[PDB]
Amino acid sequence: ILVEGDGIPPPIKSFKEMKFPAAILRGLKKKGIHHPTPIQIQGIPTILSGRDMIGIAFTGSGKTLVFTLPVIMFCLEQEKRLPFSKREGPYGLIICPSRELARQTHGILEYYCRLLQEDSSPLLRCALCIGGMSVKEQMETIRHGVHMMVATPGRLMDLLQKKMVSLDICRYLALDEADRMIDMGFEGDIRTIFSYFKGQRQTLLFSATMPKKIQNFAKSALVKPVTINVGRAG
């Protein structure tokens, strides 16, 4: 693994020392996840410190936990401090290239959120904003307020234009497969989405590749990120 940037938070070698709630630790074990992977060991402390992050990583590296477990922890703290109102949120947004990936990530979020609620946390609310859903479905969930939203870029753009969603309290934005999303034509939509932020945000970008178009994108999207590169082998 290769890490670049100033002020790199030290790596943490176990999930327990990363301070996840017990319900999360129990759920990792139920999923057979016992020890962290290299991008988790270095990436989770980076995200928990509040820094922006570039993860050069692909499926199999354990990237998904890097960008899903911190945002659940942040939302849980926020919901305790001040319960979310109807029409409030999202606080955290994950954008990905495909319906099947968004569904998968959303289900991961709801899994951990269910585990937390079975252990006397509040129930956090997670929205899926993709194609093949009606105005009806989407409007419904956003009516109750949303902690976390998982979206594909064209659908999110539609919702933002129609003022059905607002990014006014969104403080966390993760881009999963940013290379794939730009190759598929969504650069403009993603860049436009960033301009819907009225205030500051922590931005995470995950990509298996890093060609010049993506290097330039990341320069525009992120601020002083820590880069973590798992390597072509790992």
Residue numbers in the entry: 169 to 402
Paper lines:
In contrast, DEAD box protein 41 (DDX41), a member of the helicase superfamily 2 (SF2), is unique in that it can recognize two different types of ligands, double-stranded DNA (dsDNA) and CDN45. In this work, we determined two different crystal structures of the DDX41 DEAD domain in apo forms.
We determined the apo-form structures of two constructs, residues 169–402 (DEAD402) and 169–399 (DEAD399), at 1.5 and 2.2 Å resolutions, respectively. In the crystal structure of DEAD402, helix α2 and the Q motif are located adjacent to helix α3 and motif I, and the N-terminal residues (169–173) form a β strand (β1) and participate in the core β-sheet formation. We hereafter refer to this conformation of the N-terminal region as the “closed” form. Interestingly, a malic acid molecule from the crystallization solution is present at this putative binding site for the ATP phosphate group in the closed form structure. One of the two carboxylate groups of the malic acid interacts with the main chain amide groups of motif I, while the other carboxylate group forms a salt bridge with the Arg residues in the adjacent molecule in the crystalline lattice. Therefore, these results suggested that the closed form represents the ATP-bound state of DDX41, while both open forms 1 and 2 represent its nucleotide-free state.
